[PDB]
Amino acid sequence: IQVTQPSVVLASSHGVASFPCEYSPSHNTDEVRVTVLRQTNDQMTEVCATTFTEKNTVGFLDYPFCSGTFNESRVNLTIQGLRAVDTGLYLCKVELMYPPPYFVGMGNGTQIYVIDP
Amino acid sequence: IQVTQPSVVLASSHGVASFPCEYSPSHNTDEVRVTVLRQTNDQMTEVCATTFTEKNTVGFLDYPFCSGTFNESRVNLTIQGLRAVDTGLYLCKVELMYPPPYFVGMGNGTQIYVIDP
Numbered sequence: 001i002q003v004t005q006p007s008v009v010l011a012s013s014h015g016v017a018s019f020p021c022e023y024s025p026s027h028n029t030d031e032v033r034v035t036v037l038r039q040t041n042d043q044m045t046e047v048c049a050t051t052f053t054e055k056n057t058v059g060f061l062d063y064p065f066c067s068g069t070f071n072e073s074r075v076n077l078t079i080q081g082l083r084a085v086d087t088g089l090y091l092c093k094v095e096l097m098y099p100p101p102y103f104v105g106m107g108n109g110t111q112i113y114v115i116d117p
Numbered sequence: 118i119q120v121t122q123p124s125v126v127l128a129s130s131h132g133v134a135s136f137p138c139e140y141s142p143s144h145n146t147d148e149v150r151v152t153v154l155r156q157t158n159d160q161m162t163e164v165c166a167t168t169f170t171e172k173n174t175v176g177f178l179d180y181p182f183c184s185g186t187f188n189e190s191r192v193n194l195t196i197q198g199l200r201a202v203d204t205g206l207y208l209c210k211v212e213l214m215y216p217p218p219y220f221v222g223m224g225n226g227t228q229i230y231v232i233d234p
């Protein structure tokens with residue numbers, strides 16, 4: 001099992017940071033639960049999360065500041081409304097809900113830099 | 118009218134580059150045609166393009182190497198299959214097809230750096 005994400009992402013002047021979160025192993029029938037966590041001193045804060053049961057579908061509908069899409073082995077994440085205080089480490093967590101066997105994995109985190117707009 | 122896009126995007130190690138393309142003014146009923154152009158010496162090459170008629174929908178369905186979603190005032194773009202040689206300046210073009218009046222705008226380009234380790 002393995003989840004990976006980019007090391008660094010430079011947010012847009014308007015505070016948008018988009019990047020992929022990839023995982024293995026993957027299958028044609030994958031359905032996943034994706035969770036974005038910000039890591040600080042010893043602890044993590046959940047930023048947003050969503051479930052994807054099919055491709056070509058926009059997720060995180062109930063989170064104004066997160067959006068994303070999904071296809072086998074990859075979740076395209078978008079984090080919005082970022083401010084200077086928000087630069088830091090953001091972990092991507094992926095849970096394979098179907099097909100069995102079940103498994104959970106987490107990336108090493110993407111350093112998001114919100115550079116002086 | 119105005120279209121803006123990030124200045125720099127560091128492509129993922131798997132050749133994935135995602136970034137927003139924002140326009141103004143916007144409207145709840147907006148329907149747009151989005152075009153991605155790669156700019157080289159004096160000329161431009163059309164990479165991919167798609168039409169969005171409703172929010173929360175995934176576009177560029179007919180392009181294996183492009184994807185994206187749309188919401189009022191913002192198109193979230195994703196270009197994949199990128200190689201080191203594809204490093205370059207990518208312009209985002211937006212045509213507001215509805216509601217009237219018709220308008221077309223283009224950003225100053227996003228410089229996408231690709232290093233496929």
Ligand SMILES: [Cl-]
Binds near residue numbers: 006007008127129130
């Ligand atoms: Cl990278």
Ligand SMILES: [Cl-]
Binds near residue numbers: 127
């Ligand atoms: Cl990216």
